Symmetry: C3
Subunit: 185 residues, 3 copies
Amino acid sequence: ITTNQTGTNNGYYYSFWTDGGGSVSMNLASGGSYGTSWTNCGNFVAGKGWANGARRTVNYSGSFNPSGNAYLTLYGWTANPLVEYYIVDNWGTYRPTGTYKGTVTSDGGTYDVYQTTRVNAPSVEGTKTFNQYWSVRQSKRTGGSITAGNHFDAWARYGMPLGSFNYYMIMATEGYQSSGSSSIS
Amino acid sequence: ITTNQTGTNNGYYYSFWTDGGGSVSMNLASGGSYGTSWTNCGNFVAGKGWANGARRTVNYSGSFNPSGNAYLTLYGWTANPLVEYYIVDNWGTYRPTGTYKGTVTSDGGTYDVYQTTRVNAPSVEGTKTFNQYWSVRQSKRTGGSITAGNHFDAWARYGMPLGSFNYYMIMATEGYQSSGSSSIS
Amino acid sequence: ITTNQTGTNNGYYYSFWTDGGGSVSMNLASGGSYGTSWTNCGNFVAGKGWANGARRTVNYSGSFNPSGNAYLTLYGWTANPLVEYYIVDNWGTYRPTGTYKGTVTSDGGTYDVYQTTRVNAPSVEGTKTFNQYWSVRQSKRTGGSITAGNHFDAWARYGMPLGSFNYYMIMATEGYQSSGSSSIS
């Protein structure tokens, strides 16, 4: 596919979004599998996952090959409160950051946790003000387990409460003003 | 009444305070009912409620007619720690704000929550440094239910702990450098 | 002793550290008892306590006589997350401070709680970025009970989570660019 959309493929939720910039394509493959390719994109988010978020152990594998800024990250939203969350296992030429809260250790890795506030920004609920919660792995990797709940709990300990899992949770490839490819199952 | 004071009226706690500025009066009426009138005030706080705060469902009705800056807000203090809290349903020409923490949804509305710190400021415990917790309704209204505990819990999730309800909780009219009136039960 | 080191004395853990500056000595005495003496030091930390932190009631007595900057403080570290904590009962010409979070009341006193972030700083885990949690008594004293858990719980309420007590907890004398002495049991 090449146009913004949502749906199920091979029993798996999937979502594709781009701001029109450059060229971006997403391959929908067997089971939970997908890939992406892009050239001088503006912004895009793509991945496979679940229609609804949840406390789950997210297992993933593949390849991630960015030329410029891109993230490899679990990605989702909650409602009440509205919040966009990231748990980033890998990234390109830019490391995602924000207001430093601390750290969480999970799945053999240590992630820095950050918080940022988007003011009157696009969201699943429209133009809104909301918080972004981040966990960014201190060391890059492609593949393994991401035990979502360990992040959720740690964020809660740092005063970062999550709402209702009324929206998706995808294992996403996201890029900004760059090129590259990914293939993840 | 027209002079700073505290007491019970019709079985209800009540409190009146002004910094002397302009003219401010408070009507003590049947049951939980009161009203206020004021002209070019400096600062005043007035309302009816409880001698002691608590997890309760606060039901209120009436009219709120500010000409300038005024708030219509549940208002109280705790000890250990000392904290001044607001849950603002309505306001005048100024919207109460502070350090953005997030949001809480309750009683059919969505309130932004904010935190501010008063340094060496007047309090129920004298000149003190302390935090103010806010919930400010995203849309103005006069009347309904304010389920206090929903705010308390959300604030707690955002790292905003409340102390002991050693002081009042009133459904208050508060004004600053302005005129107007209110009538609330 | 006069050289950086760790060990047990009279059944009590002990730790001594200095950055070489000026002259600093530590007396290891009976039971939990120690003392320190120093002249124009740079930085030093010394005290007696436990190899491992814990929720305990820490009882201490003695004298604390700083000429310049020094703290009298319970002092420890956790892992996962890595955090350096202080609960300061007394200090010299400088009052320890940071980002104001609020207060906690314990052992007949009221402490301000603060948080600071050390970026790429020395720690028990090496050069690291980490948070420091503080409780600083509003009034100076030498002697009494410090119920550690009351601080731990309050910090948790303020979004300041503690990790695993994989490291020491000492009742410490710490100085910076100054002189003085202490004797504490």
